[PDB]
Design a protein around this ligand. Structure first.
Ligand SMILES: C=CCc1ccccc1O
Ligand SMILES: [Cl-]
Ligand SMILES: [Cl-]
Length: 162
């Protein structure tokens, strides 16, 4: 298990523009296209990202390409935030996967105001952080997922991803 498989599990793979649980235009492996509700804005966006007129559709490789760039960006986003950086570096490898997941899912923005959990995670108060983390919109909107990540943080193992 690693980050890519893990994310591949929680996000799925779709080769045609689709709406995400929030109702936003996405594609591939959790690749956000636009928050706008115009499918055409979406399409333009895809075209720009892939580098060609896609007409709302892409290939596997293209998907994976975006995915790579995205995990990349996540981590970089983490390493570049003064609040995140120190927490991330305190964690072990599994738990670091969980940090990237969240980030991938909710932005460096979303994650940044989870202050209390941040602090908890830094102190290594697993069970505590895990409870705190559930008290959130993120958990309530996407419970199955949120639960896998949260377990990941809590245990330090891949069990949630069996
Ligand atoms: C609650 C946030 C956990 C966390 C720590 C470090 C970097 C990213 C991240 O999501
Ligand atoms: Cl791109
Ligand atoms: Cl879910």
């Amino acid at each position: 298990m690693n980050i890519f498989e893990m994310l591949r599990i929680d996000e799925g793979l779709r080769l045609k523009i689709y709406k995400d649980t929030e109702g936003y235009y996405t594609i591939g492996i959790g690749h956000l296209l636009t928050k706008s509700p115009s499918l055409n804005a979406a399409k333009s966006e895809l075209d720009k990202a892939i580098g060609r007129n896609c007409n709302g559709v892409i290939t596997k490789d293209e998907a994976e390409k975006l995915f790579n760039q995205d995990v990349d960006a996540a981590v970089r986003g983490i390493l570049r935030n003064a609040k995140l950086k120190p927490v991330y570096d305190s964690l072990d490898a599994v738990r670091r996967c969980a940090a990237i997941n969240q980030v991938f899912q909710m932005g460096e923005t979303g994650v940044a105001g989870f202050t209390n959990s941040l602090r908890m995670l830094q102190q290594k108060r697993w069970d505590e952080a895990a409870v705190n983390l559930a008290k959130s919109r993120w958990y309530n909107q996407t419970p199955n997922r949120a639960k896998r990540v949260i377990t990941t943080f809590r245990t330090g193992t891949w069990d949630a991803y069996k």
